[PDB]
Design a binder for this molecule. Structure first.
Ligand SMILES: [Ca+2]
Ligand SMILES: [Ca+2]
Ligand SMILES: [Ca+2]
Ligand SMILES: [Ca+2]
Lengths: 480, 480
DNA sequence: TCTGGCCTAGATCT
DNA sequence: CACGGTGGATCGAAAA
DNA sequence: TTTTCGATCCACCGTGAGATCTAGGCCAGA
DNA sequence: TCTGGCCTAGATCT
DNA sequence: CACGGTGGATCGAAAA
DNA sequence: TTTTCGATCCACCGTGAGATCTAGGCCAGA
């Protein structure tokens, strides 16, 4: 009978990102201020945590890894979803279907601990698998949808491991997860049996190369084609599609960074205009024109292209992407590239990120007309894997993965969770053991995406909408 | 007339490390819980901040740097100190004297912003100057002392700059600061004129090499001697001391890390036992015995020596230092080094870190007997600069800097503030400009060490005491 | 019969 | 021995 | 009899992050 | 009159 | 258009 | 008349970080 609810207390706890001691200090000092009641003790909020946590039968924490069985998280998370429905019984008493997306990531530059010398690699680099429910329908009848399908707040962990990314472990855990998905059953809740269909789409093309039968990463995994032969419409329109590889849905993240890098590469090569920078002087010309365009781009648009000495081109990620697209005329003047074509890239990126249904005939029309205008303008550079996958293969996988609007299917949401992971591991863990820290990060991320608390917790929305482009809204199949 | 005081509200704000929006959300949700009063608005707490902030006449924030005049912070901070006295008038109505320590640091691996291309270096590496009051006395009559002279909570900023460490800027800002110290006046407060004596001791020997007239860093800056000639007692006991170089007081931080590294170097060289690892096979012997001792040290003491690829030997910092010293018999057995000598190193490190007065005759006795036992045991390795400065020069600078108990004079406190700096710059800044972020970090660190709030704010003390060593407490001049 | 010049390569502390 | 911290397991003791 | 609630301890964690003289080789060398 | 072998150096995406 | 955020300047309007 | 207090917007920031096939040279070459 205190002022706050224990569910509201746990939601505020994780919304403010407070610690246990921090909470006892706040509560004891507020009682010291003289209001006899103000909060539940941490005992009550850990009892509320005990409502969020999956059964011990399916959790597995170790010194060096942890996992959970898939079905157990589906049953738990959909149980938590039934209370989010305004009345889980006043819905029609029929089977429902959860369409979910899942995937995984390797992230590096992790803090190294001084404990538990345990043989495997130490703690060099994190690798985690994760899942998120997008949509519940009974024949298209949306009973629940994520209000923010792109927020990290809804990504739920399936496993994590302190191992660097490698095609070996990548294929092993992929095929094992696929088997576990085939070995899953519709969940049950108080007389409701709900099917679950999963899409392994929350994955970068950079791992899809391992999940595809292409030795190169520069070969389009949907084409199985070389960059030289990539520049033709007909031969790739006359190529078959590999087995279920549309499950590798459109990775909206890398497409934009690859667009930025390929357009900068072209801006460098406007001197000699050959795909490869191999040749005579073209290296010195590249060095010169790259430095010149970095300085004339910085002085007018106030950005610095980031530096890496272990090796990597840049981190343009999100902000350089959107800033580069905010007024494309700016880079069109500085680099001297056509503004129409970057407006087409804006149109398609906006259509992909909108999060709504897209008419595939108009999309395929604009994509092939963009391929036309590209090759007639800049042929000599072989377009990257992702921009070819966009122009030729995109409409096909859009029509395949049309059961959910694209942009809700994304990895940007899940890989942003690594931001939480590090901050979870540093603040909210108990550091007396690696196994303890692994239990901490497990339960902390399960609370971080407890759907009911994720519904009733603090958030900020003032970023509601922004100016869509005219050819985009022509392309946009927007209804409401 | 709300429940919390605005000073208590600001102290809780910065104790919990909350944001402005986080505070409005907490307060509005707590009013939404129905207790009509609970906190002052952020308006009240920014008015309380306006009490902490130094006058605009002496602050200087820029796009790329910021500073404050020294006298202005002394006058402000001692003004804040007068309220910490139980009754600033019931003290004897006489002049007081603040003995303070100060210094600076360069720290790297800083987050790079995408804004304000401003010419100088970008934001590659931070360099900040800082000060802290230790002690107020009127002829030894302690009227105030820091209860925790080693906590970062009392370090106060004097300037900061986005420039990498370099002997040039180091000497320029050193000499300028020294001039500004000579150009300072005793503060005034409501009929009390208080003198201020500063010690530039919060600095590593690694910068003291620039502040000393020694081209080498491996040459002892107090000796001005070579490592070969460093191994003699008499010739260095017969060497004069440079001008005021005792102001470069005992850097307790690097002494312990250098002890760890030099003892590991000796553990490697137990095969051939020559100072330099130059020679025939000694390289292969070093590689082998280093790997072997890393593995036999890890498997029993559960530690991993950290890796650096830009270049650096290790980061043993604090935890590897104290863990290595907790049961020295462990490393004595694994490396095969004498336990007595590492017990002597423990005794002297414990005496330095105790924070209390030390009898210099007994200290000089034990230090020269440690030099004897070292050279008779391990002569062939030339002891490092810092361990020589300890054994020969330490008692001299202890008797010089005896006006304050050593260990309160330290840099570990100030350089831990870089932990706050990064976390201050990422969370609590406003990111609309570099100049805005520099104002944020300025005022945030001034609040982080507002002495009155630093007194009345949450903290944790259960780490009160631990087992001193017997020869130490023999050496320890401990009274109370 | 053994000090100096050149350097110099490769150890040295963050 | 720098020190301000890290959540869970447990004691125990007092409410309930 | 069970719940709750504070205290307690556990085994560490983050903050210390580009240039250098000098030990020695060698080479002559009368 | 123009495909293959060797490689190979130097572009390629994080 | 990812989204959860960043303190100050200002409006305004309601206490005081 | 001044203070206070919520809302608001500003111009962005952190989270995406070691191995590769293939384009082309060349070299012969009957
Ligand atoms: Ca990643
Ligand atoms: Ca990746
Ligand atoms: Ca530093
Ligand atoms: Ca240093």
């Amino acid at each position: 009978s205190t002022i706050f609810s224990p569910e509201k207390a746990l939601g505020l706890l994780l919304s403010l990102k407070l610690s246990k001691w921090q909470y006892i200090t706040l509560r004891e000092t507020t009682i010291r201020e003289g209001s006899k009641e103000i909060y539940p003790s941490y005992y009550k909020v850990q009892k509320a945590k005990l409502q969020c946590y999956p059964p011990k039968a399916f959790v597995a924490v170790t010194d060096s890894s942890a996992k959970i069985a898939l079905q157990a998280l589906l049953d738990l998370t959909v149980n938590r979803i039934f209370e989010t429905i305004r009345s889980p019984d006043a819905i029609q008493n029929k089977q429902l279907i959860l369409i979910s997306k899942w995937g995984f990531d390797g992230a590096s530059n992790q803090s190294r601990y001084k404990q538990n010398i345990e043989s495997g690699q130490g703690d060099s680099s994190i690798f985690m698998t994760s899942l998120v429910p997008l949509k519940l329908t009974a024949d298209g009848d949306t009973v629940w949808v994520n209000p923010k399908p792109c927020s990290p707040m809804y990504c739920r962990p399936v496993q994590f491991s302190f191992v660097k990314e490698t095609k070996d472990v990548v294929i092993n855990e992929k095929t094992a997860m696929d088997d576990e998905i085939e070995a899953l059953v519709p969940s049950k809740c108080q007389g409701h049996e709900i099917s679950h269909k999963l899409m392994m789409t929350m994955i970068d093309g950079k791992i899809c190369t391992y999940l595809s039968e292409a030795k190169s990463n520069a070969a389009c995994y949907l084409c199985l084609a070389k960059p030289t032969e990539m520049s033709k419409l007909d031969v790739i329109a006359s190529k078959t599609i590999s087995s279920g590889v549309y499950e590798f849905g459109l990775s909206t993240l890398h497409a934009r960074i690859n667009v930025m890098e390929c357009l900068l590469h072209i801006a460098y090569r406007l001197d000699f205009k050959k795909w490869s920078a191999r040749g005579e002087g073209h290296q010195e010309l590249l060095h010169s024109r790259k430095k010149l365009i970095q300085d004339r781009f910085k002085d007018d648009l106030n950005l610095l292209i980031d530096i890496v000495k272990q090796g990597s081109g840049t981190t343009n990620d999100g902000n350089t992407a959107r800033r580069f697209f905010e007024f494309p005329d700016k880079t069109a003047a500085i680099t001297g590239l056509d503004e129409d074509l970057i407006r087409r890239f804006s149109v398609i990126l906006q259509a992909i990120t909108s999060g709504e249904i897209i008419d595939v005939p108009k999309f395929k029309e604009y994509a092939r007309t963009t391929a036309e205008k590209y090759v007639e303008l800049y042929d000599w550079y072989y377009m990257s894997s992702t921009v070819h996958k966009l122009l030729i293969h995109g409409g096909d996988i859009i029509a395949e993965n049309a059961i959910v609007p694209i942009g809700s299917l994304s990895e940007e949401a899940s890989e942003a969770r690594n931001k939480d992971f590090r901050r979870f591991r540093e603040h909210h863990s108990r550091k007396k053991s690696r196994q303890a820290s692994n239990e901490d990060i497990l339960n902390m991320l399960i609370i971080s995406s407890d759907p009911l608390i994720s519904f009733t917790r603090p958030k900020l929305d003032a970023h509601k909408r922004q100016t869509y482009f005219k050819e985009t809204v022509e392309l946009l199949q927007l209804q409401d």
